[PDB]
From a paper:
For the Aro1EPSPS fragment structure, we identified two copies of this domain in the asymmetric unit and they adopt a near identical conformation. The regions corresponding to residues 784–794 and 819–823 were disordered and could not be modeled. The structure of Aro1EPSPS is composed of two distinct subdomains (I and II) connected by a hinge region. Because the Aro1EPSPS fragment was crystallised in the presence of shikimate-3-phosphate, we identified additional electron density corresponding to a molecule of this substrate in the cleft between the two subdomains. The lobes of EPSPS enzymes are known to transition from open to closed states upon substrate binding and our analysis confirmed that Aro1EPSPS-shikimate-3-phosphate complex structure adopted the closed conformation. The interactions with shikimate-3-phosphate in the Aro1EPSPS structure were primarily localised to subdomain II. These molecular interactions identify key catalytic residues of Aro1EPSPS such as D715 and H796. The equivalent residues have been implicated in catalysis of single-domain EPSPS enzymes as well as in the corresponding domain of C. thermophilum AroM. Similarly, a near-complete loss of activity was observed for the D715A mutant localised to the EPSPS domain. Introduction of the H796A mutation in this domain had a less severe effect, with Aro1 retaining ∼20% of EPSPS activity relative to the wild-type protein.
Residue numbers in the entry: 387 to 818, 824 to 841
Write the structure that this text describes.
Amino acid sequence: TDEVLVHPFTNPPKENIIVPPGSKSISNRALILAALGNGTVRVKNLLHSDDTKHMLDAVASLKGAEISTEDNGETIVVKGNGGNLVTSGEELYLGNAGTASRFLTTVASLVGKSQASDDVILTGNARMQERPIGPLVDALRSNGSEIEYLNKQGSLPLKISAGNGLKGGRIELAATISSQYVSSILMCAPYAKEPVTLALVGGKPISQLYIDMTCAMMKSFGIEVTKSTTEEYTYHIPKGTYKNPSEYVIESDASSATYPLAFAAMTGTSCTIPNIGSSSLQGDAKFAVDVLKPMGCKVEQTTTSTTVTGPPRGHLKPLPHVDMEPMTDAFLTASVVAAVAKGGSSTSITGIANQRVKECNRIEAMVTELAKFGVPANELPDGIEIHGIDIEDLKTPEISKRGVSSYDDHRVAMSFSLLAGLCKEPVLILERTWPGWWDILHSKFKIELD
Ligand SMILES: O=C(O)C1=C[C@@H](OP(=O)(O)O)[C@@H](O)[C@H](O)C1
């Protein structure tokens, strides 16, 4: 963790066009779906990260899916043959890419034998080898997979016997566990022998929006999942093969999009995200229309683009109540916008209890740091209540608590960098995804730093 001193947004540019990096969640799914699909797909706007880099090399190794890059590595070309994969004999090294290991574990259960090997080995580093993966291994074994823990019980490394495939039919999966286990099974379900009924048991899953994103992406690749008539969390997946589209563009990250949009809202300037609109797979795409618009912003949104122009500085309106369940990651951004919407009514955000168990307690972190700016705030039973003030923010002193703590949480720091820009003197962010945001502050918004 490092330090960054954000200078006031003294005279921002009038208009600004920002294309955020691609979504991580969408990037990771697209590579699995393309590897299993039939046809050659050019994947654009992929987010390069631990998952994708390890995923890319893992798919490269398996026989039956070919990976290459074009246009200076910005285009990933995947040619699938319809999911007829065979072992290379190479151990697939996944580092500590948690999502890749969950997705690839079920892919490996589909792989056929070769003369080099009768199995697929999935490995990773020491942190990988402490990650629990039991609930997924249990469900695949229950469906005919043969999986051996090669080191510690319940984690990678895994040896998955090839040539077995998945029986299909009913697969039961506990609902308390990561949605990434559900998603991992959904994407491989069409390749089971028998059509799959994926029934979550033991309660309601928490990250339902990410299950829905997997289903919608599956539909883009030619396979429509259907929900049960009597069970909200039972999914019926046809047997089939994905049809790879000629091109698939990874949506830019709509959560990251909220920070430049909030900048425009908060400075009385204009920001356009030219490739994120109302047809987005991501709930956070609704931030502009469901948060910034009621708060006094002039907002236009087409199916694929979003433009936000804030009201004059100091003129944001409090949003008396907003349910941010469809977009919980954007509540930190909503909170700093609300901090300068003078009331009147407070801004009350509910539906974000799940946001209390992330890197830090983000609700608690937001209340405590807001106090440092002179912004009253308090927790609600289901969220947060912000008592916005005039842009008479507390003037910042040097080397005497000018530090805003980010609690090692990426989003907390980016949110408070916006509020920092509205103060009368520079503000230092302490204990500081999207490294380019700090670059974009200086290159696009032309904000001085350090
Ligand atoms: O499938 C995905 O891409 C994601 C599902 C969620 O995981 P959990 O269901 O474990 O919360 C989310 O927290 C994570 O950031 C990404």
